[PDB]
Amino acid sequence: GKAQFGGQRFGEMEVWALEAYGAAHTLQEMLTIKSDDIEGRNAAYQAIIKGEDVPEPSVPESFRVLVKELQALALDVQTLDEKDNPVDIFEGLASK
C-alpha cells in the first residue's frame, strides 16, 4: 500500500523472469536481504550506511515461520547438509 509506507511485492512471474535472466544473487537478495531476512535487512542498512558490502543472508524468516507451522502439523522438518545430517535452522532457539 501507499499510506501504509510499504514496498512493492515481487510476483511469482517476477521471480521467474528474474531467474530467466539468470541473476542468481539479485533474486537471492530479493527474497532475503532486501525483504524480510532476520539480520539480513539490518546488516544491510549497516553495510550501506558504513559503505561496506552487504553480507550473505541466512534465513528468509518467512521460511522459518513456514517450518514452525509444519511443526504445528507434526510434520517433521529436517534440514540436512552436504551429507545427510541435521542442521539447526533456528539458532539455539528450540533446543529445549
Binding site: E19, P60, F63
Partner: protein
Amino acid sequence: TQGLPRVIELFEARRPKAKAVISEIDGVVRIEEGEDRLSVFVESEGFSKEYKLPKDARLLVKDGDYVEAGQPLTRGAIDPHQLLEAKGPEAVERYLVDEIQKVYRAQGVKLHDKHIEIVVRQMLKYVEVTDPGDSRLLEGQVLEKWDVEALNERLIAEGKVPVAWKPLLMGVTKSALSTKSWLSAASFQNTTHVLTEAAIAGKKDELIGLKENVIL
C-alpha cells in the same frame, strides 16, 4: 483456430473433443457398413481388429488401402495416449509440438520449437513398470525415465535382468505434481495431497529445482 483451448488440450494430454480413431498396427483396410454401424476392419496377415465408427464423422483412408501404426482414420484431433502406446514416443513428440505450433503460427505468433520441446520432453519423462525382473521394483509402479534408465544399466552390468516399461505421457500439471522435490508441487497446487504422499514416504529434497530452492 481452436486456440488456447487446443493448446491446453495438448499440454494437459486431455481427451480431444472431436477425437479421431487410429489404427493399432499395419493391417489391411476394409470398410464394413450394415447401414447401422459404420465400422472399419484393419487386418494384418495374421491379425485383426475392427473399430466402431459413426456414419457422420468423415473418414480419411479409402477402402482396400494399406495402413500404418497409429495412422489416422477420421478427420479430427488425435488422443495423445492413444497414439502414445500405438505409434511410439517419437511421433508423440512430433504431433504434439506440431499442433501447438500449428495454432501459434496461425494466430501470428512465431517462436522457436525449442521451448515447446523442453516442455514436451518434460511430459514423457515417466514410464510404467512391466515385469520388474531382478530389480526391486513392482509391476505398475510408475517412475521417471532417467532413473529407470540408470537402473537398467546397472542391472545389465551386474548380470541381472533389466526392467520392461511402457512410455507414459502425462499432462504438465501431473508432471508438476510428480516432480522430484515435494517443495515444487507443494508450491504449485494440490498441496495437501503432495505433502501427505511426501512426508509419509519420508522423501528428502536436494533442492535441485529453482522454485524448489526459492522457497529456501
